[PDB]
Amino acid sequence: VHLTPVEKSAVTALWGKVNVDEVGGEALGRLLVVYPWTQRFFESFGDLSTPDAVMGNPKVKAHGKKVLGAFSDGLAHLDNLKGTFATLSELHCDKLHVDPENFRLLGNVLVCVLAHHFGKEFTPPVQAAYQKVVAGVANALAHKYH
């Protein structure tokens, strides 16, 4: 993906304010709440019976942090997202059989979480840049299927 130098600057400044121990969990919890069939992939996680259970669920918070860490790895390697997520793709397409529509969904949930946290700071230009990012990640994660 190619961001303009000002998109890269705006993206990285916002990201540097990201609570790395929470946002990941918010995005995953919302995925499981907004798109409840994704909970099928996490029956190992315990209580998901209600939105408050989802969001408060320690396993959710736990797993959301590692997902945020991958999106970070992606940001540091924007010109080579396929390589970075080559093994992750093997894991989500060959082993788990996650329909790749759901990768677009999580990326768009993450954008909604960034908007939630940053408000006006999450301007339309800034959003435009992040859409570029998360589109990149989803497809590099879908790469096997290509």
Binding site: G29, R30, V33, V34, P36, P51, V54, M55, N108, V111, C112, V113, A115, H116, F118, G119, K120, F122, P124, P125, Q127, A128, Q131
Partner: protein
């Protein structure tokens, strides 16, 4: 299909738009046009520029439209009949574009209404917007 809860959530969440209906509508658009440029192909008669009173005023109707769609939530096909004709029969809007606008509307709500954009309300709004999208892309006359 919205639960009774879903409709109270959209009712409650969307009500708080209020006078800002215009503003949030225009921004959601701005968001869509910048983030997803192909969607400009439907608006070549518009002034794409930022702040453009045509974008700004168009946003006011989508929000009303959606306010009206919230107003006839359980009668939406009858209530959105005209917009179905416009979007499905006349304009031939490809349904993905509704998912893009639907996402930008959620982004805007999240950005402007954080206390109201709880996970439950987010999920209800997404279903509501998917429901509006299904009505607007279906030919049922």
């Amino acid at each position: 299909v919205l639960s009774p809860a879903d409709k109270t959530n959209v009712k409650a969440a969307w009500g708080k738009v209020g006078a800002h209906a215009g503003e949030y509508g225009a921004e959601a658009l701005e968001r869509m046009f910048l983030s997803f440029p192909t969607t400009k192909t439907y608006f070549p008669h518009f002034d794409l520029s930022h702040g453009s009173a045509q974008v700004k005023g168009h946003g006011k109707k989508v929000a009303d439209a959606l306010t009206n769609a919230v107003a006839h939530v359980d009668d939406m096909p009858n209530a959105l009949s005209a917009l179905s004709d416009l979007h499905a029969h006349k304009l031939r809007v490809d349904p993905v574009n509704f998912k893009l606008l639907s996402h930008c509307l959620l982004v805007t709500l999240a950005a402007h209404l954080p206390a109201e954009f709880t996970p439950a309300v987010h999920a209800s709004l997404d279903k509501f917007l998917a429901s509006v999208s299904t009505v607007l892309t279906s030919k049922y006359r």
